[PDB]
Amino acid sequence: LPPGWEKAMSRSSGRVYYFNHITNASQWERPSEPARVRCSHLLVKHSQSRRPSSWRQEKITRTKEEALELINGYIQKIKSGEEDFESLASQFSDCSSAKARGDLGAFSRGQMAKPFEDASFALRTGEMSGPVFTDSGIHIILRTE
Numbered sequence: 001l002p003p004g005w006e007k008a009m010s011r012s013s014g015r016v017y018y019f020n021h022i023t024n025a026s027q028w029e030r031p032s033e034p035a036r037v038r039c040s041h042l043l044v045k046h047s048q049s050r051r052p053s054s055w056r057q058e059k060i061t062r063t064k065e066e067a068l069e070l071i072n073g074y075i076q077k078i079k080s081g082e083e084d085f086e087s088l089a090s091q092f093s094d095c096s097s098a099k100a101r102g103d104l105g106a107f108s109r110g111q112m113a114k115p116f117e118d119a120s121f122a123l124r125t126g127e128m129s130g131p132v133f134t135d136s137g138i139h140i141i142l143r144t145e
């Protein structure tokens, strides 16, 4: 199985699934290193972010755990096809990258916060992370190239 990926048992269903401890991705389907990758992300900041401020809201008051709830909801809507990643990022990301549908451009190792970087580099093109925690807040990351 590729980097980060492990088999787990579903506690609701009893079926095996796969989890990635690097990107916090999880899926039923069995899965599945570049010098640069290109990603977009959606950031939900909280009261404990390094700067609890954004273009959406001057003073970010939500708790870390309320932020995780928002992230989980967005992942649901992306996975169900109810909303697409780009649209939720444009509307709801606390990163200024929201204005470019969450697109950050290409980057190499040594540039991003390590949890983000490691998540980005362990995704394959087209793959989406689960909740990824950094000092900025909580991200969902989409590897586009």
Ligand SMILES: Cc1[nH]c(-c2cccc(Cl)c2)nc1C(=O)O
Pocket: 041, 043, 050, 051, 094, 095, 096, 104, 112, 113, 116, 134, 135, 136, 137
């Ligand atoms: C507004 C913003 N974006 C990011 C960011 C953007 C891309 C990757 C990572 Cl790790 C963090 N941090 C912030 C912040 O204000 O802390």
